Amino acid sequence: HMSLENVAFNVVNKGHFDGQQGEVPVSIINNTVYTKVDGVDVELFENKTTLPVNVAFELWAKRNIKPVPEVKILNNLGVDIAANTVIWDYKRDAPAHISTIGVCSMTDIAKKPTETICAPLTVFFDGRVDGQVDLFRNARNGVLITEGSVKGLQPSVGPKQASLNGVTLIGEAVKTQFNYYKKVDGVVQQLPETYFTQSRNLQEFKPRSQMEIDFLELAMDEFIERYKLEGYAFEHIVYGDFSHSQLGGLHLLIGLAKRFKESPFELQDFIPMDSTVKNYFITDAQTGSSKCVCSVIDLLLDDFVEIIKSQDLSVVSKVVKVTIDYTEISFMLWCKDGHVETFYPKL
Amino acid sequence: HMSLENVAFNVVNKGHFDGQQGEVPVSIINNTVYTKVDGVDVELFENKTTLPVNVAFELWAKRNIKPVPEVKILNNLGVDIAANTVIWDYKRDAPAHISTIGVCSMTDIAKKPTETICAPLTVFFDGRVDGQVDLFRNARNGVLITEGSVKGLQPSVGPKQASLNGVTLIGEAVKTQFNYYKKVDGVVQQLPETYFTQSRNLQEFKPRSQMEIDFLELAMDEFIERYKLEGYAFEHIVYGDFSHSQLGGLHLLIGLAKRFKESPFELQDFIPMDSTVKNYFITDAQTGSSKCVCSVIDLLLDDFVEIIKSQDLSVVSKVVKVTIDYTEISFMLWCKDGHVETFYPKL
Numbered sequence A, B: 001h002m003s004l005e006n007v008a009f010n011v012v013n014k015g016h017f018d019g020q021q022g023e024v025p026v027s028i029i030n031n032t033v034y035t036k037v038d039g040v041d042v043e044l045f046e047n048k049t050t051l052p053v054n055v056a057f058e059l060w061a062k063r064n065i066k067p068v069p070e071v072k073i074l075n076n077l078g079v080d081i082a083a084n085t086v087i088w089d090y091k092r093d094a095p096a097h098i099s100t101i102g103v104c105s106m107t108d109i110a111k112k113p114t115e116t117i118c119a120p121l122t123v124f125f126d127g128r129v130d131g132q133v134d135l136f137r138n139a140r141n142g143v144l145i146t147e148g149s150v151k152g153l154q155p156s157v158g159p160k161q162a163s164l165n166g167v168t169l170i171g172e173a174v175k176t177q178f179n180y181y182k183k184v185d186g187v188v189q190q191l192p193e194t195y196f197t198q199s200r201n202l203q204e205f206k207p208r209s210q211m212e213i214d215f216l217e218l219a220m221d222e223f224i225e226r227y228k229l230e231g232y233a234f235e236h237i238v239y240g241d242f243s244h245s246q247l248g249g250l251h252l253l254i255g256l257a258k259r260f261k262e263s264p265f266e267l268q269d270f271i272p273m274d275s276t277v278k279n280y281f282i283t284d285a286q287t288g289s290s291k292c293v294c295s296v297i298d299l300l301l302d303d304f305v306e307i308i309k310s311q312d313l314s315v316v317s318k319v320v321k322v323t324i325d326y327t328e329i330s331f332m333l334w335c336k337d338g339h340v341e342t343f344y345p346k347l
Helices: A004-014 A053-061 A071-076 A132-136 A210-217 A220-225 A234-239 A253-262 A301-309 B004-014 B053-061 B071-076 B132-138 B210-217 B220-226 B234-239 B253-262 B301-309
Strands: A026-029 A032-037 A040-046 A108-110 A123-126 A142-146 A162-164 A167-169 A179-184 A187-189 A266-268 A278-283 A290-296 A317-324 A327-336 A339-345 B026-029 B032-037 B040-046 B108-110 B123-126 B142-146 B162-164 B167-169 B179-184 B187-189 B266-268 B278-283 B290-296 B317-324 B327-336 B339-345
Touching: A004 A026, A004 A032, A004 A040, A004 A053, A004 B004, A026 B053, A032 A053, A040 A053, A053 B026, A123 A132, A132 A142, A210 A253, A210 A301, A220 A234, A234 A253, A234 A339, B004 B026, B004 B032, B004 B040, B004 B053, B032 B053, B040 B053, B123 B132, B132 B142, B210 B220, B210 B253, B210 B301, B220 B234, B234 B253, B234 B339
Parallel strands: A123 A142, B123 B142
Antiparallel strands: A026 A032, A032 A040, A142 A179, A162 A167, A179 A187, A266 A278, A278 A290, A317 A327, A327 A339, B026 B032, B032 B040, B142 B179, B162 B167, B179 B187, B266 B278, B278 B290, B317 B327, B327 B339
């Protein structure tokens, strides 16, 4: 019973594909799907993907509408495909994964995740659905999330925030903190201690600690004096230097959020995807200071302090590996006479 | 149960829409409809119409596959729409009529031809289908075809040839000669005495009379002598004059067919539709003689002789009306000292 006209019927009456029977008339013209309502044509969907318009439309209609992990997490853990669902990437207006399992006949490589073809792929399993936990046992490579514990397996506690219909949030009407589990070539693996990025916007930026509130409210000199941060180059690294043509430092998102209230500036996101580290092309409207590639990360300031304070300030240059969002980020550390010059994410 | 995937299923298994249940996967990319067969994508339809790709695809799939009248006839009689079918125009690779009655939800203006919306339109009715003759009786404006007689109604005998899946032919396994009837504002109308064009090609041209066979086989002077055509300017009108830069005359298709065997030339069909009269841009490869607008018609030579023989050669200029394919064509006749100079279809 699967058809274009049926998919559209569901979208019109329910907002997403809900397995309802019915049809409505449809027009396809130039990567857009229209339908007729009271004699006039109405835009339902504009294809921004590399898939065919009608295939993309169907995958969108069947997108997951419960809280799910942010795509950067799933990428960091090496997830190749999802089991009997679709993770819509709202930053690319596209599917997170281009192949499917038991969802859409045009994109399916299999009907069930146990088929031989799936063995070499790392499959995503949602423990909230019935039968998925057992499929995760029996699977050769995979990733599993659950709300509660699963006896037999050691959990890793994930981040507090998740994505719900494109909105990243910390749920209180719904649970957004998951237990993570992973398997490689038939063997369960221990996940390392990790920090997590906070996934915040620049315009609707909110603090999440007393230190963050102090940072936003206080002046520069006062903040450094309290919390005793002399020699750690917060002037350069967090606050940022706008005195020369080349913009200096400015690698923590909170730093941008402070500057933005006082004096708006221009960001170009020339690689628009979800990442643990982001690169922006930044031009400061007040000064005319700019930089082509500016590496930015959103750590809780408290955690950034913890990371920098636990380093050796004796060496001139050093690469520092740190586990964030379940992956190794490299940082470059420069010191001079026992204080820091700079400390930034490597390219 | 109307759907894209179902329409395609029928096309794949039956060649046209035959009301079968089933689905196959489909892709839409750039005005083309594809389907997957043994893992690979296959072109089913390329849209050359002004309709949306999926709408056009459906109308094509539901095209009429019995012998039907050539579009030029239907146009000449003033048919605006067809009742519960689709007449595909194979010269335009498009529908003959852009609106429908009980065929496709996107293009339908009504479900039945008796609805009030249909009253001002001239509807086509096919007497071979059950109930159509009665619908023709109740209709305000319409055209009807039948194989046999219909009690009460005076018939007009149509042409011998009809179109079958794009092929124009005189049927012997099937009947292609119809009785025609027409109504205007509730009143049956008498259709006039008419000639019919022969609908022949230039490359596969075949004669249909002894006179036509003689024309092709014999030399010019001999043909004019035998059928006594002195003073009727067949040298100019039919055979054509290639001695000057501007090509002279050449208005009968048989004339082209004779020339083409001896010495091929170039036609440009700059308005590609079916018409009783055609205009071509012609360049003669042998001489370099040419003409921008060359009006051509395909009458049976016998009929052309009959028409020209029954004229008054006393006037210098005269417009001559002649009924061909149920419509009035004007001809321009020039005479000088009791013989003809030229005689051609008016522009």
